[PDB]
């Protein structure tokens, strides 16, 4: 960890 | 076999082309080999995984996924539906938090876990374990990815999904695993995925279909979503004794689709995972 899971994305 | 009107992931790593929609692969379906999920756990009840999957180790307070991630990444390894194995043996680790978190001495300790607890396993055709996490450079945690990969176990590792390059990031800067990016359905670099020379293959990581917590089904994004595919595709081709633990990544590479990706910056491999099913 330091990288994902949120669930409201990024582009 | 042929899955009709697959996920297009499934249906890509079949094909020389994108745009089809048809999964072929071989009966066998990975069947004999067993491969570690290391996140956020997995819903192991879920019906897709008929039973094969199992929680052997956790780190929080309890073995349940309780984000999904988990879940996700494990159907895309081995699920009925979703999954590149369908025959494959499911063994999760949670080493990620329910808000999919977690601190470097403990993704640590999973992966050297996973490199024991594979001698006390029944997985005649061999062992993958695929991390579909990261974050910043550490030379410890890329360490304990070439102790796992040495072990006998193939790794496979997310690059990252910060469309930078991935020798800043752990553990997919450890050249000696299998470090993956992530395309689209029309065969570009996915916007998000890292590149870089450490990169060993792309497979497919936006808009992935598999299974999530509760029983569901949800698309989700990422170079989390890529790393799956290449896990299962090397569990799929160690059961047909094409390859080993050792040699998996290399022998991807070398048998993969060739240039057909777009958006590649220069310096960065350009294949992507193949099976190279023929009937
Ligand atoms: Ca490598």
Redesign the pocket.
Known sequence: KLKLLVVIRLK | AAQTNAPWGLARISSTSPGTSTYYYDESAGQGSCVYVIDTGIEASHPEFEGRAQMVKTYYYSSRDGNGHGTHCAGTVGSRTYGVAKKTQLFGVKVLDDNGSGQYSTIIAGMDFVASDKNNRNCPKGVVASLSLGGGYSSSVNSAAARLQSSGVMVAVAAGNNNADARNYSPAS??????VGASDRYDRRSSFSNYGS?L?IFGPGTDILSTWIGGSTRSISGTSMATPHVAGLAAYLMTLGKTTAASA?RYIADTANKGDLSNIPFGTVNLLAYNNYQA
Do not use: A, K, L, M
């Open positions: 450890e050249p000696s695993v299998c470090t450490v060993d990544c």
